[PDB]
C-alpha cells in the first residue's frame, strides 16, 4: 500500500513511522445511511464514534485517543483529497466515490497540519479511474426499510385499567371519587369539547372515540412507522495513454422512522479528471456538486406531552388517537384541554418546511517535473454552498390559538477557498542512503452569512407571499449573521532513509491565523519520528516470524478550534440620552490567546507471523494537553465577570492493539477475522488560580485534579423499612450514615467517568464460491448515562396525569412494608439512581452477498458481471440500559431519537 499523509507523493506503508490506519473501499461502500463515519464504529483502533440520534440528517461524533480538552471541541480534521470540509458536506457526497480513508492519529503523521491536528485527521481520497482499452460502466441500485431498534420499555408500563386505579387511589381525580364514577362521566365528557368544533361535532361516538376504556391504544404505532430508503448510481471509469477519468451520477433518498417528518434526499455528481499535457506538465481537476433537501425532527431532546419516545412511554393508554378503522385521526383528547391536540401527520401538514442546498466543490492542481527528482505542485480549491429554507404556519386551522398564518424565509451562503503550493525533491546520496525534502505554503479562508425575513398575519392559503402580511404591529426585525476566518502557513518535512532498515523523518510547521490573539499570532510546531525494521537486519529468517517493526515518535500540535472572535474587547450599546447612542466595552478579550498546545509521545511495534497469515500491532501513547480554554471567573480588579483565557492541563495515557488473521478449510473456502481494542485513562493535572476542584455551573460534572471528570451528584442508599422515605448518603461521616432530608450539600464526586474508557470491535467473515458472509461487532464498555425519562415514569408525587411504571403498584404503605420503592407522597431528585450502565455490544451489519459466475455471461458482450447482496444493520444489541438506545446521547439521555435497524437489498450490474 501507498499512503499520502499530508502532502507530496506517497511513501509506503511499511516505511511510515506515524501509526496511520488505512480503510479500504470495501468498508465504506453499500452503506444505507447518510453519514460515512458511522460505518467505522469498531474498525480503526483508538477511534470511538457515536451517532447520538437516529435522524437521517444526524452526524456522528468522532474522538481519537480520548477527549483531549475540557473547554474546546474534540472532533478531528476531515479533509477530502486536499481541501478540508465539514461532515455536513461529506454527507452530500456519494460514498461510492471514496477510494480509501486513512486515519492519521499519532504525531509525525499529523504534525504538519499543526494548530489543527491536535485531534487527529481523517484523510478521504477519491477515485481516479483505471487506464485500460475500453472503459467500464457500473450501475448500483438498492432498496430497504427502516424501523425502531427495540420496544423493551413498553413492557414495564401500566395499562389503562391499572392507571385509573392508581390515579384514583393517589387522590388525583378527587377526594372521594371512584372508578365507574370517574371513568363514566367526568372524563368521558369529551363530547363537551368535541361539540364546539364543526369538523367533529357530528362524528363523536360514531366514527371516532377519543376516550376508550375497554382496550388500550397503541401509541408506538401512533408515533413511529416503517420507513423506506432508495439509492442508485451510475459510474463511468476510463482511461487512455496519460488521460484518466471517473464520472458518476447518483441519487439517495432516506425517510425517517418517526411520524414527525425527517428526510434526507440528494442528487449528486462527480467528475474526477487527470491528464498529462507534455513531458513536464500534468493537470487535473476534481469537480463535484449536489442538490440536497434536508428536514429534521426538531422536538426530540425536549419534553412535550405526546411526542417522541416520551409520548410513547407516558401518554395514558385510555386515550385513543385512532378512529374505528385503525387509521390515525386528526386530533386526540387530553383531560382539561381547551383545544384538541393535533396528531403528528396533521401537525406535519399544518407546519410545512422545505430546505434546498446547492453545493459545489472545485479542486484543481498543476504539477511540474523539470529535473529528475523535483516536483512542483500548485493546487487551488473553492467550496461554495448556497442554502435556502422556508417554513410557514398555515392559516385557518380550527385546532389552534389564532386563525392567522406565519411565514419565514432564510438564505445561507458559505464560501471557502484554499491554496497549497509544495516543492518536493528526492535523491539518493550513495548506493544505500536516501533523502526526501518537502517545503510548502498553505492558505485557508472561510466566509459565510445568514439572511432571514419573517412575516405574519395571513388569512388565505394562496396569498402567502412575504410582502402580503399585516403591517403595523405584526412585523419584526430581520435576521443577519456573519462569520469568517483565515489561516496562513509554511511547512517543511525531511525523510532520511538508510538502506532497508532505518527510517527517520522530521517535520516543522509555522501557522498564523485570524483567531489567535494579537500578541502571539505565530505558532511553531514540530515532530520527530523513527521506524526500525528489526527483521531485515537482526534476524534474517525464521520459521514462524515473517515481519517485525518497531517505531517511536514525539511531536507537538495545537487545537485552534477556539472561536472566531474571542481575543478582543467587544463594545456594545449603552445609551446615555434618547438622541445619541453610546458604546461600552462588554467582554474584555485577551491579546494573549493561544492555540491550546498539546504534545504526544508514542511508542509501538507491529509483528506478522506464519508468512503474513497472522498480524498484530501494539501501540502505547501518552498525550499531554496544555493551555486549555476555560471562561474563568475573574477577580474584581478586572471589572468583568470572565476573561476566557488559557489555563489548565490534562493527560491521556493509553494502549491500543489490533489483530488480523486468516483461517482456511480448502482451496475455495476462506475465513478471516479481526479484533481491535483501545484502553484510555485520563487525568486533570492543574486548573485555575491554585484551585483543586472546580464544578462547571449546572452541568452535572466536576473537574477534580488527579481524576477524570466524573459525575457530581448525590449518592442513593435506598429506602428504610420504618417510614419509607428516600435516604441519601452523606459525603464523609463514616459509621455510612444516611439522612432523609435532601440539600445541595449532599453532593459528591461519583467514581464513574464521563467518557467511556474501553472501546473496541471485532469482525469475522467467510467466503465459499463467490457467496460470502461478513459480520462486524462493535462494543463500548464503561459508559454511564443519566436516564431522564425515569424522572417522569416512576415518580410518586407530581406529574400524576402521565403513565407510570408497573413498580409503583408495589408502593410502600402500612400493609405492604417490604419493597424497594418509596411512598407516593414524594419527589425524586437527580442522584445516583438515575445513572445507568450504557455499555453495549452491537452487531453493526450482517451482509450476505453473491457474485454471479463468469460462465453465465459468455456469449453476451454487453453485460460483464453482476452482484446481489442482502444487508441487515443494527440487528442485535446487548446492553443493560432501559431507554430505547444506549448510544443515543451522552451525559443525559433525554426524549431521544433511537437508532434504527435497517434491512436493505441491492443489485450491482458491472455491464
Amino acid at each position: 500500500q501507498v499512503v499520502v499523509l499530508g502532502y507530496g507523493t506517497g511513501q509506503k506503508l511499511s516505511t511510515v513511522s506515524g501509526s496511520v490506519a488505512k480503510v479500504s473501499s470495501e468498508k465504506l461502500a453499500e452503506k444505507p445511511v447518510a453519514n460515512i463515519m458511522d460505518a467505522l464504529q469498531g474498525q480503526v483502533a483508538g477511534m470511538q464514534v457515536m451517532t447520538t440520534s437516529g435522524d437521517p440528517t444526524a452526524v456522528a461524533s468522532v474522538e481519537i485517543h480520548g477527549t483531549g480538552s475540557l473547554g474546546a471541541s474534540s472532533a478531528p480534521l476531515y479533509i477530502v483529497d486536499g481541501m478540508q470540509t465539514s461532515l455536513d458536506v461529506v454527507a452530500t457526497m456519494n460514498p461510492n466515490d471514496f477510494e480509501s480513508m486513512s486515519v492519521l492519529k499519532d504525531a509525525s503523521a499529523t504534525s504538519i497540519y499543526g494548530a489543527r491536528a491536535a485531534n487527529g485527521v481523517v484523510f478521504i481520497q477519491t477515485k481516479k479511474g483505471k487506464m485500460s482499452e475500453r472503459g467500464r460502466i457500473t450501475f448500483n441500485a438498492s432498496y430497504g426499510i427502516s424501523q425502531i431498534l427495540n420496544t423493551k420499555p413498553l413492557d414495564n408500563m401500566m395499562t389503562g385499567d391499572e392507571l385509573l386505579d392508581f390515579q384514583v387511589k393517589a387522590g388525583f381525580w378527587g377526594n372521594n371519587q371512584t372508578v365507574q364514577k370517574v371513568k363514566d362521566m367526568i372524563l368521558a365528557g369529551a363530547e363537551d369539547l368535541y361539540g364546539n368544533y364543526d369538523s367533529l361535532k357530528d362524528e363523536y361516538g360514531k366514527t371516532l372515540f377519543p376516550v376508550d376504556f375497554n382496550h388500550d391504544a397503541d401509541w408506538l404505532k401512533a408515533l413511529f412507522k416503517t420507513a423506506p430508503t432508495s439509492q442508485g448510481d451510475i459510474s463511468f471509469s476510463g482511461g487512455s495513454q496519460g488521460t484518466s477519468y471517473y464520472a458518476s451520477i447518483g441519487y439517495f433518498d432516506q425517510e425517517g422512522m418517526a411520524r414527525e417528518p425527517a428526510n434526507f434526499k440528494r442528487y449528486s455528481g462527480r467528475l474526477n479528471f487527470e491528464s498529462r499535457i507534455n513531458e513536464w506538465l500534468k493537470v487535473g481537476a476534481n469537480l463535484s456538486g449536489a442538490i440536497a433537501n434536508r428536514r429534521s425532527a426538531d422536538y426530540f431532546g425536549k419534553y412535550y406531552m405526546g411526542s417522541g419516545t416520551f409520548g410513547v412511554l407516558t401518554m395514558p393508554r385510555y386515550y385513543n388517537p385512532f378512529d374505528v378503522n385503525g387509521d390515525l385521526a386528526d386530533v386526540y383528547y387530553m383531560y382539561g384541554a381547551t383545544r384538541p391536540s393535533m396528531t403528528e401527520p396533521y401537525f406535519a401538514k399544518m407546519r410545512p418546511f422545505s430546505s434546498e442546498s446547492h453545493q459545489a466543490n472545485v479542486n484543481g492542481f498543476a504539477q511540474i517535473t523539470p529535473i529528475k527528482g523535483l516536483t512542483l505542485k500548485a493546487q487551488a480549491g473553492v467550496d461554495i454552498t448556497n442554502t435556502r429554507t422556508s417554513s410557514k404556519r398555515m392559516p385557518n386551522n380550527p385546532y389552534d390559538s389564532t386563525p392567522l398564518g406565519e411565514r419565514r424565509e432564510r438564505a445561507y451562503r458559505d464560501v471557502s477557498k484554499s491554496f497549497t503550493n509544495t516543492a518536493e525533491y528526492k535523491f539518493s546520496i550513495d548506493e544505500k542512503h536516501d533523502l526526501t525534502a518537502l517545503m510548502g505554503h498553505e492558505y485557508i479562508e472561510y466566509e459565510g452569512d445568514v439572511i432571514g425575513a419573517s412575516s405574519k398575519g395571513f388569512e388565505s392559503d394562496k396569498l402567502m407571499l412575504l410582502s402580503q402580511g399585516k403591517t403595523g404591529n405584526s412585523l419584526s426585525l430581520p435576521e443577519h449573521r456573519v462569520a469568517e476566518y483565515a489561516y496562513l502557513s509554511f511547512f517543511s518535512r525531511f525523510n532520511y532513509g538508510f538502506d532497508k532498515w532505518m527510517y527517520i523523518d522530521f517535520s516543522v510547521r509555522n501557522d498564523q491565523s485570524s483567531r489567535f490573539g494579537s500578541n502571539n499570532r505565530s505558532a511553531w510546531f514540530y515532530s520527530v519520528g523513527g521506524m526500525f525494521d528489526i527483521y531485515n537486519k537482526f534476524i534474517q529468517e525464521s520459521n514462524w516470524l515473517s515481519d517485525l517493526r518497531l517505531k517511536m515518535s514525539y511531536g507537538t500540535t495545537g487545537n485552534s478550534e477556539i472561536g472566531n472572535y474571542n481575543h478582543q474587547a467587544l463594545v456594545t450599546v449603552n445609551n446615555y440620552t434618547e438622541d445619541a447612542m453610546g458604546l461600552s466595552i462588554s467582554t474584555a478579550g485577551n491579546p494573549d490567546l493561544s492555540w491550546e498546545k498539546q504534545s504526544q509521545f508514542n511508542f509501538g511495534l507491529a509483528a506478522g507471523a506464519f508468512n503474513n497469515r497472522l498480524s498484530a500491532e501494539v501501540d502505547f501513547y501518552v498525550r499531554t494537553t496544555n493551555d486549555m480554554l476555560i471562561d474563568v471567573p475573574m477577580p474584581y480588579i478586572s471589572g468583568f465577570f470572565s476573561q476566557y483565557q488559557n489555563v489548565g492541563s490534562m493527560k491521556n495515557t493509553g494502549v491500543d492493539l489490533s489483530l488480523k488473521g486468516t483461517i482456511y478449510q480448502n482451496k475455495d473456502w476462506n475465513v478471516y477475522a479481526s479484533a481491535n481494542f483501545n484502553y484510555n485513562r485520563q487525568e486533570i493535572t492543574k486548573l485555575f488560580f491554585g484551585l483543586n476542584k472546580y464544578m462547571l455551573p449546572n452541568t452535572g460534572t466536576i473537574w477534580e485534579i488527579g481524576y477524570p471528570n466524573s459525575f457530581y451528584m448525590a449518592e442513593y442508599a435506598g429506602i428504610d423499612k420504618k417510614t419509607g422515605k428516600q435516604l441519601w448518603y452523606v459525603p464523609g461521616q463514616v459509621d455510612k450514615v444516611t439522612t432523609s432530608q435532601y440539600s445541595a450539600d449532599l453532593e459528591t464526586r461519583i467514581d464513574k467517568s464521563v467518557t467511556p474508557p474501553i472501546t473496541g470491535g471485532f469482525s469475522l467473515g467467510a467466503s465459499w464460491k463467490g457467496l460470502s458472509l461478513d459480520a462486524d461487532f462493535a462494543y463500548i464498555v464503561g459508559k454511564w448515562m443519566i436516564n431522564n425519562d425515569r424522572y417522569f415514569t416512576e415518580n410518586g408525587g407530581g406529574l400524576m396525569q402521565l403513565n407510570k411504571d408497573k413498580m409503583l403498584l408495589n408502593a410502600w404503605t402500612e400493609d405492604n412494608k417490604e419493597t424497594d420503592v418509596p411512598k407516593l407522597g414524594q419527589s425524586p431528585q437527580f442522584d445516583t439512581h438515575l445513572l445507568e450502565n450504557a455499555s453495549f455490544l452491537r452487531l453493526k451489519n450482517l451482509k450476505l452477498t453473491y457474485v454471479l459466475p463468469n460462465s453465465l455471461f459468455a456469449g453476451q458482450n454487453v453485460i460483464g458481471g453482476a452482484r446481489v447482496y442482502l444487508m441487515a444493520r443494527n440487528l442485535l444489541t446487548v446492553t443493560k440500559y432501559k431507554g430505547f438506545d444506549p448510544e443515543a446521547g451522552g451525559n443525559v439521555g433525554k426524549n431521544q431519537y433511537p437508532n434504527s435497524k435497517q434491512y436493505v437489498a441491492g443489485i450491482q450490474l458491472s455491464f
Binding site: 422536538y299 412535550y304 405526546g306 391536540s341 424522572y791 437527580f830 443525559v892
Partner: peptide
C-alpha cells in the same frame, strides 16, 4: 406535536 413543556429536566 406540542402543548405543555412538562419539564423538570437536567442540562445536557
Amino acid at each position: 406535536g406540542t402543548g405543555g413543556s412538562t419539564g423538570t429536566t437536567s442540562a445536557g
